[PDB]
Paper text:
YSD1 has an icosahedral head organised with a T = 7 laevo symmetry. The mature head contains 415 major capsid proteins arranged in hexon and penton capsomers, forming a shell that is remarkably thin for its ~650 Å diameter. This shell is further decorated by trimers of the auxiliary protein located at each threefold or pseudo threefold position. First, a clamp formed by two loops, C1 and C2 immobilises the E-loop around the threefold axes. Second, trimers of the auxiliary protein dock at the threefold axes over the clamp and E-loop locking in place this critical capsomer interface. In both YSD1 and λ, the N-terminus of the auxiliary protein staples neighbouring capsomers by interactions around the twofold axis augmenting the major capsid β-sheet of the E-loop/N-terminal arm. However, in the flagellotropic χ-like phages, an additional hook-like structure formed by an N-terminal extension connects trimers of the auxiliary proteins. This interaction mediates the formation of an external protein network that braces the inner capsid shell.
Numbering used by the authors:
A (entry chain C), B (entry chain B): 2 to 51
The structure:
Amino acid sequence: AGLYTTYQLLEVQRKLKTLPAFFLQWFPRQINFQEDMIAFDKVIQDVTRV
Amino acid sequence: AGLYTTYQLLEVQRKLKTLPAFFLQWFPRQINFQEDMIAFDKVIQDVTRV
């Protein structure tokens, strides 16, 4: 004391919230492209006929 | 873009319908005959009589 109260310091309590990955388990593939759009093709192939 | 866009194509999504063999599993014997017809004989012998 006197001019100023003396202190001891203890360890700093650092909480660190995260947002852990859950829905990215269903998105396995990473495909990069330097192009404008991404197109797909869906094709239904009717086979089961006598 | 400009005149028209560019495209990165991913894999073709092929919906394909089959009809797997459930009834053929009781028909094991295969006969590749060149003749006309196929003759069977069935014989029932009644013995259980007094």
